[PDB]
Amino acid sequence: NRGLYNMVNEYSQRLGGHPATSNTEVQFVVIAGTDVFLEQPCSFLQEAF
Amino acid sequence: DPTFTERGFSKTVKSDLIAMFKRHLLEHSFFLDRAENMGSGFSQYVRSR
Amino acid sequence: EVHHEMASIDTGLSYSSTMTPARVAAITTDMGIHTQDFFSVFPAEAFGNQQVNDYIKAKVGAGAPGLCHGQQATCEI
Amino acid sequence: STKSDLPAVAAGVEDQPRVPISAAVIKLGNHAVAVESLQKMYNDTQSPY
């Protein structure tokens, strides 16, 4: 709900939204990945394709 | 290609590698043969290959 | 152990850098059909009978050794 | 005044001697831009680019 520029800054500065993990079979949920590079656009707009 | 094997070898990555083996075997085989069919691709295709 | 500490500041106010996804290198997740079960999600709940519950669990709900497509996508309903 | 203060802003940055550097450059519109890839060092160290 917060300001736009705050959303955009947090978008790259931080992870979040509890994204699923990579290179695993069952698609676990991750909290502290070692070196993972996640970028989720569907979270910000709340839309599915 | 180092981008595929940056995470070591795991089941998901091995499966991606074998799928790409199948694709690339079916597509880019006997390259100079299709080099005649492509037409204007004459030199840039073979040079790139 | 050798240590080394650095400092950084952004000078201008407005944004000074932009990334862009340019080329799709690979598709990790397979887009196929893999329903996420609930009986591994909700193990505590159960029906009234043990007979009906066992029958239900055996008919439908029931580590994969090998996978040809990749990291399977959980489909939720 | 900006001209009177420019030596104060560059605290010895113009003083340091310059050396030629190897990098690809392109002309976009009016801006000259340097374009490069650092993947050699990360491929040498088996770390994710």
Side-chain angles (χ1 to χ4, degrees):
Chain A
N1 194 23
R2 314 171 286 181
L4 246 197
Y5 290 106
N6 197 38
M7 289 277 92
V8 165
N9 298 328
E10 185 190 341
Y11 175 98
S12 78
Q13 276 186 6
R14 201 188 65 180
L15 303 79
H18 298 297
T21 187
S22 315
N23 286 349
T24 71
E25 302 183 339
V26 224
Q27 203 167 22
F28 277 176
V29 50
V30 76
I31 161 166
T34 55
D35 279 342
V36 206
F37 303 83
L38 277 150
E39 170 189 358
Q40 29 185 3
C42 304
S43 82
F44 168 71
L45 317 158
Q46 286 283 324
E47 188 188 25
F49 304 81
Chain B
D1 267 12
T3 71
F4 296 92
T5 153
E6 62 189 29
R7 310 295 184 182
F9 290 175
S10 37
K11 261 167 291 92
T12 63
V13 186
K14 294 180 176 182
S15 294
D16 193 35
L17 262 53
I18 180 208
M20 279 197 157
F21 297 154
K22 293 174 193 313
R23 287 192 40 200
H24 186 290
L25 193 157
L26 270 180
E27 179 182 355
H28 307 107
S29 288
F30 311 108
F31 67 98
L32 203 145
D33 184 358
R34 80 176 41 89
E36 301 291 338
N37 169 46
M38 285 190 50
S40 56
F42 302 103
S43 315
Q44 180 177 353
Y45 185 89
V46 157
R47 279 294 281 261
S48 44
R49 196 51 184 261
Chain C
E1 277 202 353
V2 192
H3 280 209
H4 186 243
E5 306 175 28
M6 322 159 62
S8 60
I9 39 153
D10 192 10
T11 305
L13 281 174
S14 52
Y15 291 121
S16 37
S17 54
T18 292
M19 63 173 314
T20 303
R23 180 171 199 174
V24 42
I27 311 181
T28 294
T29 301
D30 98 287
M31 313 175 187
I33 303 312
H34 177 282
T35 309
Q36 166 211 355
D37 60 311
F38 268 12
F39 301 89
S40 53
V41 177
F42 293 99
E45 306 207 9
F47 276 75
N49 295 334
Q50 275 316 315
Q51 299 189 354
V52 168
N53 195 16
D54 284 325
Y55 173 85
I56 288 183
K57 187 184 305 174
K59 284 295 295 191
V60 169
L67 18 97
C68 286
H69 290 104
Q71 165 177 328
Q72 305 169 346
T74 62
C75 323
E76 229 159 0
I77 299 203
Chain D
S1 165
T2 296
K3 179 191 60 189
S4 67
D5 291 353
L6 272 187
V9 174
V13 166
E14 294 263 345
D15 186 356
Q16 309 299 331
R18 80 212 298 267
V19 51
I21 295 305
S22 157
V25 296
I26 55 184
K27 191 186 82 66
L28 295 166
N30 286 331
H31 319 288
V33 186
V35 183
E36 74 179 341
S37 65
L38 305 161
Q39 211 184 6
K40 277 314 293 167
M41 57 174 296
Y42 292 169
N43 292 323
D44 294 340
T45 65
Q46 305 174 356
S47 73
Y49 187 95

